[PDB]
Amino acid sequence: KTEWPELVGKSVEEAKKVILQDKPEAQIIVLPVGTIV
Amino acid sequence: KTEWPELVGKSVEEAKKVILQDKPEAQIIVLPVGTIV
Amino acid sequence: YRIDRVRLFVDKLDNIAQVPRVG
Amino acid sequence: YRIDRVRLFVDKLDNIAQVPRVG
């Protein structure tokens, strides 16, 4: 699983819980929208 | 050692401790992602 | 492209604004 | 290119968002 379209609109906390459940090793980075990466 | 891929996701404090252990002279600069350098 | 990383792009209320993807 | 410098690019929670490199 590489994408989480079910998380659009949800909080960071709920996104993190869902991602770590699907992907235990995930390194979760939180950035404002529009941030150049 | 020129790169620290093990620090992705970690806090600044843990990154600093690891870098200064590997590289005592390091001058650690902290910038938001997307900052033009 | 970093397979263990997941970026969350958040709005002004810290809600997820875009679909999260590995990378 | 400054060999003693290490930039840390951090996210909104001050966590490292990109691999740190000398420069």
Domain ranges of chain A: 1-37
Instruction: Tell me which residues of chain A, numbers 1 to 37, contact chain B at a CB-CB cutoff of 8 Å.
Output: 27-29, 31, 35-37
Question: Nearest CA of chain B to the CA of D14: how many Å?
Answer: 6
Region of A7 please: left (phi>0), alpha (psi -120 to 50) or beta: alpha
Instruction: For residue A32, list its beta bridge partners.
Output: C10
CA distance B26 to C3: 28
Nearest 5°: phi and psi at C16? Answer: -70, 125
Question: Nearest CA of chain A to the CA of B10: how many Å?
Answer: 8
CB C11 within 8 A of CB A33: yes
CA A6 to chain centre: 10
Closest CA to B8 of D18, A19, D8: D18
Encode C1-23 in three state secondary structure: CCCCEEEEEECCCCEECCCCEEC
User: What determination technique applies here?
Assistant: X-ray
Do residue C7 and residue A37 have CB atoms under 8 angstroms apart? yes
Resolution in Å, one decimal, please: 1.8
